[PDB]
């Protein structure tokens, strides 16, 4: 009935003075913009229909046209920043925030969806949606004794829109808004729907990606144990944002990193550091590098959980970026660790892969590996076993690497290599 309409017919129907003809034309526009294959968003915009849809959003007497217009504008705001800006310029933000209070659940759901698309464009439209006062009705939609009584799709769309209101930086979301949203985020983080859990973990990862003050706002709510529990989840869509948030949290203070450790996160890294997905391995190794850059008792906790063998393994075989993160972890371990801990590191078989990685075409990992080498040699000097070490490095073909690096382009590279071969070989 309203399928395969032309934009000219849609315009002719919406420009009529017949609410039913306008409704049919708006539904035709919705069906047109709901097509997976090249929806004619720009044609609809050029036609000048966004203002008419935004006006229809306010016709409470005709809820069907409200729903159809919300759907159409949602799909126009789902595209480019210019198309989302066209939606916003029509005055759709306050209209959607008003629709949030609709007695019809499908209309309020579509308004949540549209506002999520608008806030996901970037920090500017996000903060504008917040200034128009969307957070209060959004959270009110979730003010129920048990979230399980809400419809699955409804709760998922609300969780995702809230995640987008926590998303993007430069600037990060307003502090008062984050404080307003966090308790509902904790509630959702304790929900049982994997989609809700994944979106809530993404929201927490967004909120934790920044200065230690934001990380502290998050950690004070006590979500770290639940983040670790979800880190042990089987659904990768959940593990990814959980690991991202844990890593973000360990980028901060030693006390926040210790909060992460106390929740039992390390017990999960034996799997994360051998995870078949390369992104998970890289994120876990980067988190491990930021943990090895912490206090000595935290390095000792890393040792106790048997994670040094896993770092050795990742260094021996893994995607090169994960190997670079592992080299950073090793250098931090050797820079902040004790002599006993560095001796343990050597006894775990770090030297051979550390040497083998010195033949890479990335100067930075070369510098990192050479710095770790120097630290291990210093710890050996404190024991008088420098010679034994030197012999190990020679036996695995490392001295050849350092000598060939003496003739390298970068300055600090050949400087450190020459220092090594002069002071120990």
């Amino acid at each position: 009935g309203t399928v395969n309409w032309s934009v000219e017919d849609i315009v002719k129907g919406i420009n009529s003075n017949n609410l039913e003809s306008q409704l049919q034309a708006t539904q035709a526009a919705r069906k047109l913009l709901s097509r997976e294959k090249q929806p004619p968003i720009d044609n609809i915009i050029r036609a000048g229909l966004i203002p008419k849809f935004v006006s229809f959003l306010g016709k409470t007497d005709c809820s069907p046209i409200q729903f159809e217009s919300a759907w159409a504008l949602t799909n126009i705001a789902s595209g480019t920043s210019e198309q989302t800006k066209a939606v916003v310029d029509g005055g759709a933000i306050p209209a959607f925030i008003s629709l949030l209070a609709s007695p019809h659940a499908h209309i309020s759901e579509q308004a949540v969806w549209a506002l999520g698309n608008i806030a996901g464009d970037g920090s500017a439209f996000r903060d504008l949606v917040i200034k128009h006062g969307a957070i209060d009705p959004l959270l009110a939609l979730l003010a129920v004794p048990d979230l399980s009584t809400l419809a699955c799709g409804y709760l998922r769309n609300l969780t995702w829109t809230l995640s987008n209101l926590c998303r993007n930086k430069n600037p990060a979301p307003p502090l008062d808004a984050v404080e307003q949203i966090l308790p509902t985020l904790v509630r959702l983080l304790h929900h049982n729907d994997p989609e809700v859990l994944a979106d809530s973990c993404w929201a927490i990862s967004y909120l934790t990606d920044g200065p230690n003050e934001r990380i502290e706002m998050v950690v004070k709510k006590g979500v770290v144990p639940q983040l670790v529990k979800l880190l042990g989840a089987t659904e990768l869509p959940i593990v990814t944002p959980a690991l991202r948030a844990i890593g973000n949290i360990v980028t901060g203070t030693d006390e926040q990193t210790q909060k992460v450790i106390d929740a039992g996160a390390l017990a999960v890294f034996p799997s994360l550091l051998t995870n078949p997905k390369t992104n998970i391995q890289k994120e876990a190794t980067w988190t491990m590098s930021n943990i090895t850059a912490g206090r000595q008792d935290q390095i000792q906790q890393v040792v106790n959980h048997g994670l040094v063998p896993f770092l050795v393994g990742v260094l021996s075989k893994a995607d090169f970026k994960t190997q670079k993160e592992a080299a950073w972890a090793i250098t931090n371990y050797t820079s902040g660790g004790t002599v006993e801990q560095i001796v343990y590191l050597v006894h775990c078989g770090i030297i051979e892969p550390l040497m083998n990685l010195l033949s890479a075409k990335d100067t930075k990992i070369i510098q990192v590996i050479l710095d770790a080498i120097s630290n291990i040699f210093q710890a050996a000097e404190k024991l008088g076993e420098t010679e034994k070490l030197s012999i190990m490095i020679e036996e695995c073909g490392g001295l050849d690497k350092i000598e060939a690096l003496q003739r390298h382009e970068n300055e600090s590279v050949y400087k450190a290599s020459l220092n090594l071969i002069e002071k120990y070989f």
């Binding site: 929806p39 789902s78 698309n117 995702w160 980028t251 850059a293 912490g294 820079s335 902040g336």
Partner: peptide, 13 residues
């Protein structure tokens, strides 16, 4: 030892 650093829109179909 230093700590280092490292769907926005959805259509309804």
């Amino acid at each position: 030892p230093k700590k280092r650093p490292r769907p926005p829109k959805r259509p309804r179909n």
